[PDB]
Amino acid sequence: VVGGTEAQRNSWPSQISLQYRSGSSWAHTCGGTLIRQNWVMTAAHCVDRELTFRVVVGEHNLNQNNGTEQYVGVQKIVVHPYWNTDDVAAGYDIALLRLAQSVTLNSYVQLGVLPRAGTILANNSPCYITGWGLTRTNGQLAQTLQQAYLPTVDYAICSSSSYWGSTVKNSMVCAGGDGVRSGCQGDSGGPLHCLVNGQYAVHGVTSFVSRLGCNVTRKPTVFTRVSAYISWINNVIASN
Ligand SMILES: [Ca+2]
């Protein structure tokens, strides 16, 4: 997250850290959202490579013990059937991870609230992006969970030639683009939390930013629109 601020420890309890094993140690690679005690929602491009993955819930500071973390391996990976790693602009950047064990819910670990199917947000709706991603283009990961206010940019405006144009589809949600705040490498797969009916719900899965850089004027961070995948998500969890 570029242009963000440290979030109050565990103020976004459904946020998870997706890590892979590198030799004898682990490394953060993506964010994710806990949607069931044993299911995590993240981006398909986060699991393109065949490595060993693990999920950490109740995390805040990646480098030290907070006394609230729970570590669990990934037992099954279900990527959307239409995902094409060579065409992220085509969409379908969403994957579901079945955890090897069910995590314990508590003050630091809670399930994320998903929107109703088909729900589209009005322009400039209040939302927040959270993650441990780069805090600057070509920079380095944040040690502590970061958050940034990132209001939405509706499809009409986002798909105009003045922004992303044809690159963005209705199956995506755009947010930010103020040139100061944005998601960045490492935030991928993470949530876009938006206030709806007095309640924060996860409306997006961080997917991509401009090739030119993370925080670019008129190049909002693009997210997979979760509300377009409710049926698929429900069919997978009630089958696996
Ligand atoms: Ca920690």
Side-chain angles (χ1 to χ4, degrees), residues 59 61-62 64-66 69:
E59 182 64 295
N61 185 314
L62 301 177
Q64 56 177 297
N65 174 50
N66 297 102
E69 310 91 324

Side-chain angles (χ1 to χ4, degrees), residues 4-5 17 31 35 41 45 76-77 99 110-111 117 130 136 142 145 148 157 168-169 175 194 234:
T5 51
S17 172
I35 59 176
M41 174 178 65
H45 77 254
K76 188 173 186 175
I77 298 176
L99 283 38
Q110 213 70 189
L111 304 185
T130 51
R136 263 256 231 176
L145 184 63
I157 293 176
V168 156
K169 289 183 177 182
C194 304
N234 292 312

